Point group: D2
Chain length 378, copies 4
């Protein structure tokens, strides 16, 4: 009955009969006495854990959904979902998804799984990719990175379900604060909670959030058997960062808008990429599906080698991951997109001077000034 953001603080809190703890106590026990228990359902830590369940309930609540399942990492959430794709079945996706994600395509490719890449930023190449024989899953990551292009979740989901296939959105980029894939018509939202949700760069995690109860059983059976389960202490940490998730996200957003305007005024900056610009080729889709433009910005550096620019920052940290409280900068060409080749990256239209910013919660004008000195050099 209550509202998001109240959900962030109390959503799947708990209550704690016995003592009245407001913050639920941390359940580290691997084992349980089955005689105390007036109705046995906590057996063993890999299967059942109170702290882990609270995090799950919280996450499910953020999306008005019946089920969530958390994992040791974002990659483990993806690996679990992908595991359900059978040989002689087909995962429609895109040549531009996350590199770890593409690795789970690689591994899947050897279990009779056909990976059909095609384009989903248009209607046109949606229908063909969808008419693929034996197609089981459609895999959308939106916005994409580092190009910050998007995919119309509702329309892709309309055309996919027409074929009784499953649609997952990797929603890590935007967080549930900004984008609600299940609301848009997707069947699953996938998160690396390592980013935004936990939000302090001090714990690894993944989550799936969904409604299908058949899917719920297959997912929990896999997690229990594969054992890709997170620790209780790490569920505590992810749960902790959640309270401030929307406060952090909109601080991150506001600063992003600032830096984009700083960027658009630099003589040594070419293209600036940001889902919320009026020039963005899919501005109608961003406005239709995202509540705000996000914490990530990309741009073409013109003032010389990216490698030299990277060092000049004296506030942004250079490094990988995103969404953390500390602002980060990277050159995908040198870092995140290193494993792809240039003509690859070039097909992608990822130049070697593409710079990516992940915006933290520091003072906006502090971040703007570090960016400007860095660009200016000297």
């Amino acid at each position: 009955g209550m509202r998001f953001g109240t959900r962030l603080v109390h959503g799947g809190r708990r209550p704690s009969a016995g003592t009245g703890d407001v913050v639920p106590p941390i359940h580290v026990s691997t084992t349980y006495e089955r005689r105390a228990q007036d109705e046995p359902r906590y057996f063993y830590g890999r299967g059942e854990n109170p702290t882990r369940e609270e995090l799950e309930e919280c996450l499910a609540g953020l999306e008005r959904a019946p089920f969530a399942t958390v994992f040791s990492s974002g990659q483990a959430a993806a690996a679990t979902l992908l595991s359900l794709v059978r040989p002689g079945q087909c995962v429609v996706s895109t040549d531009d998804v996350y590199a770890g994600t593409d690795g789970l395509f690689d591994l899947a490719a050897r279990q009779g799984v056909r990976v059909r890449y095609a384009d989903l930023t248009t209607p046109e190449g949606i229908a063909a990719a969808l008419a693929e024989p034996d197609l089981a899953l459609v895999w959308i990551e939106t916005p994409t990175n580092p190009l910050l292009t998007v995919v119309d979740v509702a329309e892709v989901s309309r055309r996919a379900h027409e074929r009784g296939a499953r649609v997952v959105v990797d929603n890590t980029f935007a967080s549930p604060v900004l984008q609600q894939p299940l609301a848009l018509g997707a069947d699953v939202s996938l998160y690396s909670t390592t980013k935004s949700i936990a939000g302090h760069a001090d714990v690894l995690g993944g989550a799936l959030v969904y409604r299908d109860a058949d899917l719920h059983a297959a997912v929990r059976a896999y997690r229990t058997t594969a054992g890709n389960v997170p620790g209780a202490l790490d569920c505590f940490l992810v749960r902790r960062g959640l309270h401030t998730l929307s406060l952090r996200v909109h601080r991150q957003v506001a600063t992003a808008r600032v830096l984009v305007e700083r960027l658009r005024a630099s003589p040594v900056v070419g293209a600036v990429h940001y889902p919320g610009l009026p020039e963005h080729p899919q501005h109608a889709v961003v406005k239709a599906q995202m509540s705000a433009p996000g914490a990530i910005v990309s741009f073409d550096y013109l003032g010389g080698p990216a490698e030299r620019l990277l060092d000049r920052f004296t506030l942004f940290t250079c490094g990988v991951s995103l969404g953390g409280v500390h602002s980060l900068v990277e050159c995908p060409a040198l870092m995140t997109h290193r494993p792809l080749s240039a003509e690859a990256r070039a097909r992608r239209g990822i130049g070697e001077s593409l710079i990516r910013l992940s915006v933290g919660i520091e003072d906006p004008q502090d971040l703007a000034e570090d960016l400007s000195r860095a660009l200016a050099g000297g």
Copy 2:
């Protein structure tokens, strides 16, 4: 350089050669080997710990100050500062300061320290209480709880420093987001970091932030000898919550204002105390000395017994403590100020029907709606 809303993130965050950790590691070791450093400075966890030291630089950094020292609790921070008042010396304070402080004041009185309570809102009552012989320490807590009256730190410090007295401000209530005691002319800011600084209701800590190097030495020697140090994991949790202190406080303040409006609108609400109201009894001081007027609210409930009001809240948690992520309601006559003396209450202000809100970060409209329908009960 760096503004406050950046120092929260990067204060106390020197890197770490070899590995490059963005978040510094948690130093749990109580124990050190000589030969691993090049001169001897880490001998033992009680005296020295990098994680504790990192939190300290951050806290000091929030007030543009040389030193900070953190503690096992706000009470411990208070006990430490108080320990530096010798037998025969007089502490001037108020009869409405936090009890934990006064309980501590009682402890001092039995060692030969004498204690004097004082209204610190009037030129005379300030100028008189600051004529207390052998004055050594002026203990200012502003806003005072639960009534949210306010004391002019600059003025009171512009007269204590004439008597040869050190001034502390328990700045727990406002946090260094909203009030800057050292800038206002005080010598020490005291914090329970247990409240808004840690801010997630999952760790205790205190802090003292100051400038006097002579004081720094005395403060560390006591913490070392008394042993009231926080643990590493706890310093980590305090340090972690502090990242979002600015974002949290401003949300908390934004909602407090909404609740204050809801309160003012209600026919079963009498007095409303809030430092931001055009008729707060110290609006000019609040105007000049804080940047926003805080996220605690108090009010007289007219609709029946206070207990019955408390049960009717479905989102507000009933508990003592304040400033954490979860909104809390209490009745000082039943929760905090409870054990008092029913004749005395009327002097200090604390009424039967007095209710105190500590505003969190849930949706302002959710909290407002919970409040409005506790106020409507009558069974």
Copy 3:
């Protein structure tokens, strides 16, 4: 510096500058590149110094060049299984751990061939390793809950003549009692959740091995599957490890005490414990195990199993094993209530079989609890 010293200083990977004796806990998911010279710390799923110290410690215990830890024992097993391709054979035992068999099932449902075998006789082992396309031989020894014991050296020699990797699930024994690599295996598999962490407060897995190309494949899978343990999780396992040898020998010594009172009891029939003389594989236990472990099983003759379980006041009724708190369970109700009663009678698992997991409590108190509980 020897083996009890391995537990304390194993990988106690230094603290340049501050001098910390206990290494600080590295929780950062990420790393400033610039902050290291030749940057090789990038992202926590791939790199983490706390995890590395634990792995280095664990490998140290078997004098192995490598180790990799995991979010759970299941994850360790799943990683090793992932290297077997469809059509290839994994040879093992019907009475392997139910988590493992689920993983066999997953793999079987991918086309990998899982072949179960008797692995305790000469005939039975040739009738195992003869399968064509044999890439993996999976030994759990001792096997739980009947405490049978497979000859690791002999099975390893035979498996290797067809080029098959041999893994030993050494969770039951721990590396203080049994060393699979020294015995001939290629991989030691662990649920550190059990006796290794020792305190029943953290789930973890590990693999310990000696081949560098195996190493690369294991790390590539862990990075991609993302079945990595947490920083704080690793700290708890590491901290547990320090006392592993002390705890293990306390548990074994108490196990031996409990075995005699059991065999003395008129409401107890058969008793299982690898260290008894009449154990059909008694030569093998001697040769390959420095002590016979701290797991005990027995046939209970004196009333329904559920009532026996209800009479303990020191032992706890639950699962996992190897921890400091002693546990009891009844396989037919708890490890295998979900079995065909049919497949129960022939696994040698009676409806009244009781398993003890011995902790570190006073042996007198545990013996008293057991005795009054047996109510003989």
Copy 4:
């Protein structure tokens, strides 16, 4: 009930719902009162179930009705001392811990008299309680660094003749070895930082005692001065506690081996150890506790102590003690350093006196490190 079951289960809970064997970690500072029947929990500094669990466990180790834990040993000590009123005297062991003398100087500053005594002779124990208004008799045993011992029962006999309070700082022996309350003292003081927690990764203190009015005052003090430990820290101490007995048993057995090694080295003079016949209270040693401990001191004869300290390659060069990692220190140069030159030698402390704190590493490993060190 015997002395190792209480380490595991003392203060350990069911979870009237979930059944957690290891009780969950209560990090909350605040408590939704509205539920709790007749209210127990109001605020963290005053109440916390995790903290209480540790207290029940510690009290159980000496079957005392009460225990209170603190941020540190100093804090436990500071609390006990605050109860002494201005103008009263504390009789104490003159080679007490400096931190205690630091607190002693606080009470020296805060009105109290600090008066040490030879606590080892009748012809001076009596003339120590001769002090007017004797509040506290403060014993630490064995002492540092010469390991002299004080007869707890005898000193208590005459201290109680005056109606005073007797505390024993019992950190050194731990409750595994020595039981001050059983011996006749009123309070046991611990630095749980040392062998109790046991792994050098948490600070802590404890008081264990039996009188309800001391209990009220101790708790009133802790709540007010706020020297409270965190919930996670209490978790670490409690977790380390499980193995305290196994660890102490181990450290003692190794200490004895080291003592034999030392006695045979031509560069060793006097050796101090509570378990040698030559120790002047070796008789009292035998009386008042079960195994002579994990601390050993000796005069190095090869010149400056730094010569020796620098040669160890397993022993860690630094302070604290009782932990899993063996430590070596030099008191004249570290713990006992800053005492000048016209002093120190009354505490019998020479400039090549060496103190070992024995961890759990392999004994022949520790024995070998000490050998090369001694024989550069």
